């Protein structure tokens, strides 16, 4: 089952015109929310702009993230010194079976995981000296822990609940990859075969290579997103000078009923 | 810590000369988040270029997608030029149409 995760980032010295603080919100691999401190307002992204939604939804995303914003800038003061620093937080809930909500709150500083907010003991904590610095600075603030507890135990899974009921089509969206298999001589004696998958959702996809029907390995593979929320995948393999054409490509994806064979034709 | 960007160039839909399309630069796996990226058409900047939010992965490194609407053509090469703390000079990755 799905997740709702907020990606939070703040920086001690943004470029001019850059925000100090910005959040991307994600339902599964699909981004539904944008917020940055410059604009100071939460926005839907993609189809989610057109979701049939309770009228106060984006007011309440905005109010919560402004609180998160103040705390993140506050971390920097409390954090002794001149950095520059980058504070990242991964805050979200996962919905398993039984309608039961598991929570997550991990934090990273200058690209390193160093802190977390424990929900059982309502607490920020970590081993790093700077974990203690921010930790007590957040603890010593009125209401912080309570708002955090609220956001992840109630707000979060509620929001996930609402999107699963109001954005069913959006989450259940399936679009098969357009496929190509091509060849280019790599070196003397050799060719490079590249199997390529265009415009697919969901992101989960596997590609294999076959010689005459029997496995030849996966290529060397790469994934990436498109701008419309769809995805791209590609894989490449080295093969002999002129055989070469006793080869096909095998793609597996949820948007198909059965695996699809891609011939070099 | 510091992490150097991975760069991937490809088009939304399979490339066909004369047919309209989108071109993507996907820059990922990098830290810190400061980054500069241009798409190039035969050596020089594409003007109107959009990008997604600067977001990040389970491993905490950042990722970004740049894109622009375009019409491929027999006469045209494209690339992505990226600048970042971890590089001494801009890395340029040529768009392989098949990729």
């Amino acid at each position, epitope marked *: 089952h799905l997740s709702l995760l907020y990606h939070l980032t703040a920086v001690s010295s943004p470029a001019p015109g850059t925000p100090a603080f910005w959040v991307s919100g994600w339902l599964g691999p699909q981004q539904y929310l944008s917020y940055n401190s410059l604009r100071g307002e939460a926005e839907p992204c993609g189809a989610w702009v057109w979701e049939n939604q309770v009228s106060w939804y984006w007011e309440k995303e905005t109010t919560d993230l402004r609180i998160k914003e103040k705390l993140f800038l506050e971390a920097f003061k409390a954090l002794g010194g001149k950095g520059p620093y980058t504070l990242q937080g991964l805050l979200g809930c*996962e919905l*398993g079976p039984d309608n039961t909500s*598991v929570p*997550t709150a991990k934090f990273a500083l200058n690209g390193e995981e160093f802190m977390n907010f*424990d929900l059982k003991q309502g607490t920020w904590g*970590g*081993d790093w*000296p700077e974990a203690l610095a921010i930790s007590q600075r957040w603890q010593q603030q009125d209401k912080a822990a309570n708002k955090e507890l609220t956001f992840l135990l109630f707000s979060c899974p509620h929001r996930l609940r609402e999107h699963l009921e109001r954005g069913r089509g959006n989450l259940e969206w399936k679009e098969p990859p357009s496929m190509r298999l091509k060849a280019r001589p790599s070196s003397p004696g050799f060719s490079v075969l590249t199997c390529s998958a265009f415009s697919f959702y969901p992101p989960e996809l596997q590609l294999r290579f076959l010689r005459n029907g029997l496995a030849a390995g996966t290529g060397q593979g790469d994934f990436g997103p498109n701008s419309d929320g769809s995805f791209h995948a590609s894989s490449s393999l080295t093969v002999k000078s002129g055989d070469e054409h006793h080869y096909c490509c095998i793609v597996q994806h949820a948007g198909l009923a059965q695996p699809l064979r891609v011939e070099l034709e | 810590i510091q992490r150097t960007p991975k760069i991937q160039v490809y088009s939304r839909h399979p490339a066909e000369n004369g047919k309209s399309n989108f071109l993507n630069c996907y820059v990922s796996g990098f830290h810190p988040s400061d980054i500069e990226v241009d798409l190039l058409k035969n050596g020089e900047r594409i003007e109107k270029v959009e990008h997604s939010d600067l977001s990040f992965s389970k491993d905490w490194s950042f990722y970004l997608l740049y894109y622009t609407e375009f019409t491929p053509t027999e006469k045209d090469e494209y690339a992505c030029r990226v600048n970042h703390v971890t590089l001494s000079q801009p890395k340029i990755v040529k768009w392989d149409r098949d990729m």
Partner: antibody
Amino acid sequence: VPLVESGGGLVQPGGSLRLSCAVSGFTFSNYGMVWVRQAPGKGLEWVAYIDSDGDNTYYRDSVKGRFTISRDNAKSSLYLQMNSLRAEDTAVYYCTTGIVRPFLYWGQGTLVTVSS
Amino acid sequence: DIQMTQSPSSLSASVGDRVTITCKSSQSLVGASGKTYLYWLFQKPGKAPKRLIYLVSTLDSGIPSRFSGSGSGTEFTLTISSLQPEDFATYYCLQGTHFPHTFGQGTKLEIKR
């Protein structure tokens, strides 16, 4: 009182066992998790580690092909599937945290004894 | 494969005494934002381990303030300023910087009466 490990017991060489670690002390989803073991009346020994997500794992290489750490954040608990067991695997097995508070939370252990 | 080796393996000392335990790693342990992932654990017989000091010298909550650690590179020490009789246990040092992830053989600490 933060954890409880379970499912130890007596088994033959070759046999298999599944250790469970029920975390209720802290928010399990935040923590890399670790298995550590102690052969009866001897020093502590590191065994395995897992990502909080669940998609990165490490093992001592006297165990690589044979054991398998895993987690179900859903039931905030952690597992060790041990197969192809032999004599030296006899130990009390202890469940702890990895990043970001490595080795801070502990339980009573569970005894796994391997003999014919 | 990065060995931890403690000195001594065994020790009986008198209440009031100042105790010194050393931990020698075969390879340096700094390697982050100047964070050293060395740890001290202790274990009483029939009991589970507990964490004493984390990073190099940070006492865990409720660890009696007479316990302390220091060192930096490859040379580490646990120090009990004034021994008391509950201090009996086995102590271990633990490197947590590169897998594995290894313990010292332990120092068994008994109390002399």
